[PDB]
Amino acid sequence: GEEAELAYLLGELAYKLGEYRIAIRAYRIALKRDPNNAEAWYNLGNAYYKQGDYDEAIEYYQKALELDPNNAEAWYNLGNAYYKQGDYDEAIEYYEKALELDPENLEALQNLLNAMDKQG
Amino acid sequence: GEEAELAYLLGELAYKLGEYRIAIRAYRIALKRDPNNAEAWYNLGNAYYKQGDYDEAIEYYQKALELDPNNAEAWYNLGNAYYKQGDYDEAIEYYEKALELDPENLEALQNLLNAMDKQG
Amino acid sequence: GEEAELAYLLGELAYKLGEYRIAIRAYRIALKRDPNNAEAWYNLGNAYYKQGDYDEAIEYYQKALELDPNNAEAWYNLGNAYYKQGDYDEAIEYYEKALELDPENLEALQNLLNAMDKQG
Amino acid sequence: IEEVVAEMIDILAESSKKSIEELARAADNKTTEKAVAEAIEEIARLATAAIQLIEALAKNLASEEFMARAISAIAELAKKAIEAIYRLADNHTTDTFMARAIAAIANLAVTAILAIAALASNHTTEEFMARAISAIAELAKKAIEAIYRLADNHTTDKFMAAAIEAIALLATLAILAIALLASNHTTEKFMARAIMAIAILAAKAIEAIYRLADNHTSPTYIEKAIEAIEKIARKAIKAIEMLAKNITTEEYKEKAKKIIDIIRKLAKMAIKKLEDN
Amino acid sequence: IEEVVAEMIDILAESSKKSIEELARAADNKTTEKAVAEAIEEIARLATAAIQLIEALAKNLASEEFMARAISAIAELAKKAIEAIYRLADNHTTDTFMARAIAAIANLAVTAILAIAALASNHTTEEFMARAISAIAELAKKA
């Protein structure tokens, strides 16, 4: 619906411009109106990630991934959120998945090894 | 309603980015849909203040304050708009009120004294 | 309607900020809801022009002009899109029209002569 | 006769004003730090001398309308000398001879103010007194802001030190000069105006001092600025109280009290912010 | 009122005294003959000006106790200016700018003495006169 499209666009614009708080509010609307927009779930998770809101970022990344399991960036960011919270076992699994989807993600690989070291 | 939330958000974003004209148009919508949002009345008044539209800024600041009498910043800006129009008696009263709410507002205090001098 | 006003405003803001893709999406909405907004037809055409999408820019400029034949800037940009596509005969006609409306448009005049040379 | 004396004053004032402008141009036309220093010292020296010569003749102007002209001449010379020095010093920056610029402005401001007060001390019309007060405040305000700005365009060092002390000294003297002239006022309307003139000047002096210590977040100056602020506020208030005591009408007595409380609060906030830095 | 005038005098005197001390320090902190010459000339110039400003206001001090304070302020400024010049000149020696030091001291002593006498000429108490005399003699002896 037009409402969802406007919500999406406002969220995306605010997101790009760094006003993540605004983007969050707009994406909640976009998703309330249309729960299947994986992009909003993803950008919502990123908007929270950017604020240090890692638990929220995890929840939203998981939703985005259920809708789209091939989103390597979301897997990567999911792993990063787990990493930031000290859950290295989870970060490790998600870095590996991001890498299976995108073997060129050097940072995920480097972070995988670092997570492995921190987990021990 | 979602319409009000989008209107609010667009107004706020445009406002932050300096496109006050846009913000005004968006806030008029936000308030038409939801007249009780003191924040929109306030930001609307500021958006007009920023354009030199002092009579409008006064009207909207007054509405914001009726909804929220503790908005020291709005009292301050109300006083500034009166000051700019040469109505020092009013500016004086509003600077004093802003100061009662926020005694740390040096600029309001300085402006109070200046207004007192201009009023004579 | 409020939906059209929000669509318009979002389009305009994104447009000003250079996110033309966003602006296009928003303007399509604004026009779907209100087909008579010449400004959206015009800004839509510009948003496409800016992306090298000259055929789209031509279509939308034509619509804007049917609604408002006095939009010298649109005539100018229409001529530019034709020029970019190598259709100098059309660019020539539109530069002349933009100039009749605005004789001070030096660039249109210069481009008129250049188009004349390219057409031969 | 008064015309003769006044004419000599106008003549001297025009000459000096022009010489000041010529020196300022030479300093900008020239390419050395010394050109600036020389114009600053000569502008200040000439302006000082011109003012003194004017006072020397102005004292014979028994009729107030001529005295008013003499005051204006002094104030105008002082303003031009200050602005000329400011411009050269501000254009120059590079922390070279900037202390001289600050001192020169302050010294001229003091000279001019006291000269005005001296002439002003000999007349009786209330409006005239108010004009003299206004002229003093005008000069003090301009000098303060010129000094403030110069310190910001040099950045910390010792220029802000000079500015803090210069401002406090100037404001204090200006306030007292006002209080002195003001003590001869006959009505509350005028006494209240003098009080306000003091209060405004005090507030500005405080803000300038505050800003210099605040925008450099520098503990050395936070301490000095605080002391200067307290000093200004105390003296400003005492001057106000002296004048306030001669007010017999409640509307004005209350206004004066509000003004005093305002000064104190402003000073306290400026201090608190500097302490927190 | 006399307090107002006297206060302006105390203010000016303190400022000058401090500036004199700063110039003297700069001349000793610095390593050149010119630093000494500049402080000597500036100390003398500032001291002279301060004294003149004080006289200008001091003349309005109808009450003697304030006049006495003004005289003291002049004398103190003169003494500090002289001592500052002396120290710099004495530390410097080497026959460079020493004539300036001598002249500066003498000129300040003259200025201060005459200024004191000028203010003193306007009062009547005998003790005050004696104090003014003492101040003059003090300055002359030190110089």
Key features?
part of a larger assembly, 5 chains, A: mainly alpha, 80% helix, D: 277 residues, mainly alpha, flat
Describe the structure in brief.
The PDB classes it as de novo protein. This is part of a larger assembly, with three copies of chain A (120 residues) and two copies of chain D. With 120 residues, chain A is mainly α.
Explain this structure to me?
This is part of a larger assembly, with three copies of chain A (120 residues) and two copies of chain D. Helices cover 80% and strands 0% of the residues of chain A. Chain A has 120 residues and is mostly helical. The longest helix of chain A is centred in the first third of the chain and has 15 residues, at 2-16. The N and C termini of chain A lie far apart (49 Å). In chain A, 50% of the residues are buried. Chain D has one domain. Helices cover 86% and strands 0% of the residues of chain D. Chain D has helices at 2-29, 33-58, 64-92, 98-120, 126-152, 159-182, 188-214, 219-244, 250-276. The longest helix of chain D has 29 residues, at 64-92. The radius of gyration of chain D is 19 Å and the shape is flat. Chains in contact: A-B, A-C, B-C, B-D, D-E. At the D-E interface, helix 4 and helix 6 of D face helix 1 and helix 2 of E.
Could you outline the blueprint of secondary structure elements for this entry?
This is part of a larger assembly, with three copies of chain A (120 residues) and two copies of chain D.
Chain A: H1 2-16, H2 20-33, H3 38-49, H4 54-67, H5 72-84, H6 88-101, H7 106-119
Chain D: H1 2-29, H2 33-58, H3 64-92, H4 98-120, H5 126-152, H6 159-182, H7 188-214, H8 219-244, H9 250-276
Helix pairs in contact in D: 1-2, 1-3, 2-3, 2-4, 3-4, 3-5, 4-5, 4-6, 5-6, 5-7, 6-7, 6-8, 7-8, 7-9, 8-9
